[PDB]
Design a protein around this ligand. Structure first.
Ligand code: HEM
Ligand code: HEM
Ligand code: HEM
Ligand code: HEM
Ligand SMILES: [Zn+2]
Ligand SMILES: [Zn+2]
Ligand SMILES: [Zn+2]
Ligand SMILES: [Zn+2]
Ligand SMILES: [Zn+2]
Ligand SMILES: [Zn+2]
Ligand SMILES: [Zn+2]
Ligand SMILES: [Zn+2]
Ligand SMILES: [Zn+2]
Ligand SMILES: [Zn+2]
Ligand SMILES: [Zn+2]
Ligand SMILES: [Zn+2]
Ligand SMILES: [Zn+2]
Ligand SMILES: [Zn+2]
Lengths: 157, 157, 157, 157, 157, 157, 157
């Protein structure tokens, strides 16, 4: 069913955001796992899988709309070297992604692509969940101190 | 069955205390949940449901005695901005509540409303349990320090 | 994640509507139960619980958006003294609430708060169910007459 | 297998009767559900479904006989505005349809289409059950009065 | 254990109230069953049994206190001839019995018979439930009229 | 609850679309079944049931909004005579219906009927699935040729 | 445990080959799904998951050896527009990848990194499975012709 060209361009842009987040969260999860921070590996691994499922939904929607999914153009990763810097980099990426989502959702409504919009709102709700988790962990580091915070990560929850 | 007017007035006063406590505990619980303090969310939410059940018991008893439950006049909430201030505010509210309960219990006995009295003694028992929990947590903060105490709240028990 | 100030104000106003509805429905449920109208007790009790669940969603959303939930300012209850008066008061209240809901949903969209919008649309759907139930009962009183209507309430459904 | 032209014409006539009855019973059922008359929604929905299965049987039989089922020419619905008027309209429609069935059954026998005949007799048996249910409900309205009658419809059977 | 003489006298007075109520409720229940009012037979039979368990508790307590249970002096029954008169007679009897219970409870406290007191308060709680059921039924008769009220009694609940 | 008059008009137009689609998908299904194309019978039968469920949602919504469902005015069927023509006819009908949905969804938003809008977006989502299925089948016929395509339809999936 | 620098570089190169394969196979899988070729969607999806699992083993090994996994530099995708082109492209990618693997396995042995070698031989055996499946499918297209081959993909296996 031929979709609106600019809607397909926005979906490719959001797919590009999910591709960056997949790699960044998956690498962060295995860095945490290597350091023995099991709880953080578990959450970040599951965050990584959520972004993979988001990428799948964009890929299928784009193809349904008769566009060409662009899995070629990976954007900048910001890996970071310590726990706080890693979580802050994830959070910055998420806030940028939500901004792009909000734009695409408004546009999709104005051209009456309500099914693309409905899918993007469900994805945005998941992203707000990822944001909440990141903001909360960053705050906990501040309130209990990094040493207590790291000790809390060693067992799976 | 027409009840004593002053007993109905005391029951409405106690109902009013429960209404404040329901709101204060429920909001505290969701504040803790938002901060990622799961154990405190769990306990405060259950303390909140306990007060809801107390409020139910007063409402039914007042109607049985042919009075008019007053759910309109909400007393002052004292929310607080940090863990210790919140728990201290719940404790202050509970202690004021137990005082009113003791007074009503004595009076119900004087006019031979022993069933309203039996109900109030059971609620007072529950309130002494909320007080015990609050006092103990405040003492733990002091003994282990705030950072260790916060760390201990992040997993459910 | 910092929310739009006016969205938070709308959320607090809708929360205020839920708090009124919780109390009014709960007290009506127990009045019905005291009169031995078990079926009306059951339905009104379940609507009060639905409104409690709505209040909880507003509270959690306001806190996530970094605002202050206002559980202090209870609006006017209109209790009523007989079955038809009580149902009509619940109806007027629902209709006023639905009006404020529609206004907030439109505004959430203008500022791209699509998750708050998506939440409030699910709550609106629930409110339209409460309205449908109230309007239907009111029409049944008219069609079968009050005595038959009361008779049909004495057994739980 | 090439069927008799007039038999196919009769089958299309009866299919037309079924298509009117599907819509009329379905709409009556949902009108009853909207009014809170659950018992009547339940019966009329199930009659609607009976008529749908009758239509399916005509369609398949016409196809087997190498004819063209006509689902295009919808006959006149008579919806009605209150319970008695709705039931009486369903009854008039069923009586008309039974008269057409009797004629078609006679004709199928004279051209030796005994399988079309046997199908139509099983459908006529179901229609006589529909007529019996309608005649009985209308008589109950008279005997107990409309107010008691409507009260009797509010719960599922 | 030798009990207080007046406490035993009060226990025998209350036992006497129970013995009247057993007979009156049992006979009312069977009168209702004979008339085909099954719901009322069911409730009144179960009230009869409650009173029997109350009597058993008085008998055992008087024996433990080294007193002589008096099952000889049956007080006045007031049976009544129609549903409302029967219920109103049960209610008057229960109100009288509650007044005697209140007096005995006050007295047991002043002589430090706290276990007799605790038993009597549990019995008073059950009696207030009996009073509530009666008051509610009598009000239902008024609100829906006697004919609808009797119709509502023909099936078991 | 009194709905917006133009919303009810749109709901009636959409209902009219579903009614055409019910009949056309149902007749196509049984034509495939008669031809021994069991796979196509199964899919088209399930699409017809999907449109019946859509039609039920429109009817209940219009009644809730105090409108009159119009099941009388059946639009034009285009049945077709061979597999490819029938599929193309279903596709043209679906695309016209999706255009009407988009218009109604926009309008519903402008008058704040967010629950009617929410219902229509779910239905649109289903229609886009119908569309995808039809487009895919039509492309398969071209890719593998009609003879292989027919062969693939004889067994149930 | 500090690994050999050139081993880590080989590991990063092979991880790069997996990242290309994950994307190419996943998009191919969803392209097949869109065309209604379910059997091809299923196999290519499961091959993509295989590559994801390989990527994970490289990442974990590189971190264990204290190197930095490079998930930033994505190599050239060759997507293709029809089934045969897409399969040939996956085949070319696989053969290039197996070449890089053979080279790395040899070198791991020269520097006594036998655990890296053991991991890479297991991945190579999986890659030879992917190669076998692709060569086999390409040969089937030529032996049965593309129309029959496409017909054979529409049902899942
Ligand atoms: C186009 C990019 C990718 C897409 C679309 C994608 C997609 C998916 C999907 C749909 C699943 C199934 C998840 C579920 O439903 O449970 C999955 C699983 C998985 N993915 Fe990816 N993924 C991508 C990239 C990656 C990358 C780069 C890694 C690198 C580690 C990875 C690692 C995994 C792992 C370990 C699993 C679980 C496999 C298992 O044990 O079953 N994925 N992926
Ligand atoms: C008049 C004031 C209230 C009364 C009398 C009341 C009463 C009740 C009662 C009786 C229950 C059932 C508890 C049980 O048996 O487990 C309940 C549950 C609940 N209440 Fe309230 N409540 C009141 C106010 C509130 C408020 C202000 C909130 C705000 C959030 C709230 C939130 C809840 C929640 C989330 C539940 C659990 C419902 C569930 O099962 O999911 N209540 N309440
Ligand atoms: C009119 C006179 C009385 C009648 C008609 C009556 C009748 C009955 C009946 C029909 C039962 C149920 C029996 C069964 O099927 O198991 C019962 C139970 C019982 N009765 Fe009576 N009774 C009378 C007087 C009394 C008195 C004076 C007592 C003094 C204690 C008494 C004590 C009990 C007790 C303890 C039970 C068993 C209750 C339970 O635990 O379920 N009854 N009676
Ligand atoms: C107003 C229009 C129609 C409406 C509203 C309607 C509605 C429905 C509904 C709600 C169901 C039950 C679906 C489920 O939940 O599984 C159903 C079933 C069915 N319908 Fe219709 N339908 C309509 C027209 C038709 C027509 C013209 C046919 C012609 C055959 C038909 C044939 C059937 C059949 C065979 C079933 C399944 C019956 C069974 O075996 O239980 N319907 N319909
Ligand atoms: Zn995402
Ligand atoms: Zn995310
Ligand atoms: Zn309390
Ligand atoms: Zn408390
Ligand atoms: Zn609500
Ligand atoms: Zn509501
Ligand atoms: Zn029929
Ligand atoms: Zn019929
Ligand atoms: Zn007793
Ligand atoms: Zn009693
Ligand atoms: Zn549809
Ligand atoms: Zn459709
Ligand atoms: Zn691989
Ligand atoms: Zn491979």
């Amino acid at each position: 069913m031929k979709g609106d060209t600019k809607v397909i361009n926005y979906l490719n842009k959001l797919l590009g955001n999910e591709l960056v987040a997949i790699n960044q969260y998956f690498l962060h999860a295995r860095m945490f796992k290597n350091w023995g921070l099991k709880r953080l590996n578990d959450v970040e691994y599951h965050e990584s899988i959520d972004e993979m499922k988001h990428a799948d939904r964009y890929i299928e929607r784009i193809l349904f709309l008769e566009g060409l999914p662009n899995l070629q153009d990976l954007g900048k990763l910001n890996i970071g070297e310590d726990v706080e810097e890693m979580l802050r980099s994830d959070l910055a990426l998420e806030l940028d992604g939500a901004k792009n989502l909000r734009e695409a959702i408004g546009y999709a409504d104005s051209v009456h692509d309500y099914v693309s919009r409905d899918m993007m709102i469900e994805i945005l709700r998941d992203e707000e969940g990822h944001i909440d988790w990141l903001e909360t962990e960053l705050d906990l580091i501040q309130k209990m101190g990094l040493q207590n915070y790291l000790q809390a990560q060693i067992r799976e929850e």
